[PDB]
Amino acid sequence: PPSGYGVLLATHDDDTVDVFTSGRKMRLTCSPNIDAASLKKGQTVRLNEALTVVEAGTFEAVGEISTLREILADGHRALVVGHADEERVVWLADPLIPRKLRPGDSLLVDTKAGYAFERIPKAEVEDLVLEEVPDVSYADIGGLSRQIEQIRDAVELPFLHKELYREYSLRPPKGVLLYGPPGCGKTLIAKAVANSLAKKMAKSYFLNIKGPELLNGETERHIRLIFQRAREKASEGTPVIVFFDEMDSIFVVPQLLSEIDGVEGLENVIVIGASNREDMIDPAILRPGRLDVKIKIERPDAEAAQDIYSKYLTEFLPVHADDLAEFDGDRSACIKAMIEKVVDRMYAEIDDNRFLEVTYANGDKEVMYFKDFNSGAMIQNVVDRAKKNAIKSVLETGQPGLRIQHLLDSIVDEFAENEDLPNTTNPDDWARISGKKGERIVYIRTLASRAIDT
């Protein structure tokens, strides 16, 4: 019994069906065997040489993919765009007509029959818009108590006391800019605020996107998908943090602005952005309604560095026997001392810590030290090289443990490693140095000895 196929389009009271077979739409009668009521829109039906619907199958599983623009008002049809930007209306097959179809989704289609059969999930798209459980907590962050309070007030506080906000006629902020010199805590602070917020659901969503991930379709589609997924998770009533890390590279702006304005309706979606370059930011992003709350994560001072070191010099690190000698086996007092020694030597104004020499337009010259260019990322890197020198010490001398001297040697080795490179400094620093003097910087020099343009 040699037989052909077609796509089912419509079922009537007549007990006949409209089927797309052999490249054209025809009305065909069903065999008495098959029940015409149990058939479904878009289902592949089997035929014979009299062209009678003998059997019902499943939905077509291979074909063209189109990107869904919208579902039309009637609910049955959808507007989709193909590879050549050809825009077409098609019927939604039964597996679509929870989860909700949204603008940006990829649908398998037969454009000859005019049907859309399935939603094809795409990784890359999924792993772009994926929510993550945040790693970091406020206890992992050192030296930023002030800024943790600002981010709490902006993000966390509105949700906890909704009615007290309504009482004082205060509309909560909805966008945050983290900004400042690199390696100082903006990624950490953003994850930590998402973490403490999730912990106060004792059911929370945190989308982490880095700048480079956007430039990977074209940036329009990236932003459209990201905010559409935020829209999805927002429907549940849950708080949704959409974090744009490493935003430096971006400034593309008009869709980001347009999408942030678009989520103003939704009271539970918050946008946080992070930028190393305050100066290159498009002012549009910082206007009322968008990134309202501007939180500056600065470089650490001596007191902050003691806190940051405490996160990486724990008492679960092997300590050398000579170091423990001076504190008679008490590792709490040994380390807290070791952290105070390593910080004092990092932050002191000695000829060994000299880093830059600045020359101003009036002929004056000032010398900057490591104290003025430190970061949390640099403190951690100093600890990691100290650990690696202890691991080398184990192997080379036989004696286990981390000495004070491994850290102290690691400071100047770490700063010498970055006493050339462009990663180490930032316009916020030159602005700050120039500012305090009140003069323009005309010549910079490191102290090996190298020069840097102004």
Add this chain to the structure above:
Amino acid sequence: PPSGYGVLLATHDDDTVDVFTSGRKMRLTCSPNIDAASLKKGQTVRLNEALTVVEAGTFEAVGEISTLREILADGHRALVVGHADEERVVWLADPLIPRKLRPGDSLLVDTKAGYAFERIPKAEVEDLVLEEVPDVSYADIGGLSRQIEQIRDAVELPFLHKELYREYSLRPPKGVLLYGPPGCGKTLIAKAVANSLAKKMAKSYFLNIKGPELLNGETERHIRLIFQRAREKASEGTPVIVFFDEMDSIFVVPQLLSEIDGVEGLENVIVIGASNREDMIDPAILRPGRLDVKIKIERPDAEAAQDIYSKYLTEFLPVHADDLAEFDGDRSACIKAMIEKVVDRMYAEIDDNRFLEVTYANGDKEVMYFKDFNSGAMIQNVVDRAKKNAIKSVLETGQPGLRIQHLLDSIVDEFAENEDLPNTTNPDDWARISGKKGERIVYIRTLASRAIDT
């Protein structure tokens, strides 16, 4: 039993029909059952293998989409453009041949048949060109009385006194430029004038488009769609304000200039444009016939700030009991005196209010204070920070209500938050400061302390 299909093209005196079936154009006989006079252009018809019309169906509801260029003279044909820029003429089916089909509308089409069956609305084009009831009124806007008279004289007055305008041979203005530093009221006035003019109808339309919306089809298709809708609403005889907010980004201009010039015939359509960057504006937009009326929204002086505070420090805000003591429970007097104290504070030349230092080309230096860089947005954000600090004090101290100190602390906090970044300052300020001094500005810095590019 098994039957095919086709599209109806024309009906004759012969009681026969032209039908597009199976990729070809046919003359077919209607069955005796069918009344050929009641059939309609572009309608789907069922057949048999004798190829005789047995039933009238509905119109095709899936397929290609094209953008309508125009309707031809005969009234029955449309010139449409498909996805590959393939322009074609097609017949209009009955449901099109109320409302008005216009250039820009998306039409469902079968190009092989040569027919357009339906106008499919698009969500994103519909939300672009949607009118809105304006939120803001003149009572909500503080400190801009002159500018409110100027916007009234341009937009409102022509419509109220048409025959008095005719008497003096005065042609009414076509368009308004709102321009000045950011955060000072330009958006507010534009919707306040749409509001007061809608109130003088006791039907009027107000389209609100932001620059960013245009950049996200191509930029000049956006502008065609907007002005084509403005024509649709102008046909009613009522006023139509088309507001282009946040145009800083734009300057593309040619289609804007062309569409403003084209709409000058319709004297019930007004175009308002807002810009923060006076200096970057293409002079073409400001030439006679287009944005004739230039209204400058400046930064508020002390007395303007009194009026702006009063919009956000109302006596329906909880006020602390200690603050209510000194006016014996009188809230009007308590708040009026609170507003005078916070204003006097923020407009003072105290060391706490030092903002920037401007160095000139002759060596002279001038200290700029907060008063010189204030705005309506900053006043409101100072109020919102105080409201937040009240909310925190009730949680922390138990004692409800907002203290004067919450406002006063909030001033320096809000300025410190924005001391660093862009869009707190603007080229109009340097013009003003360089102007009043009569010297070029060579170096600038904030007073943390930090320099700016100039």
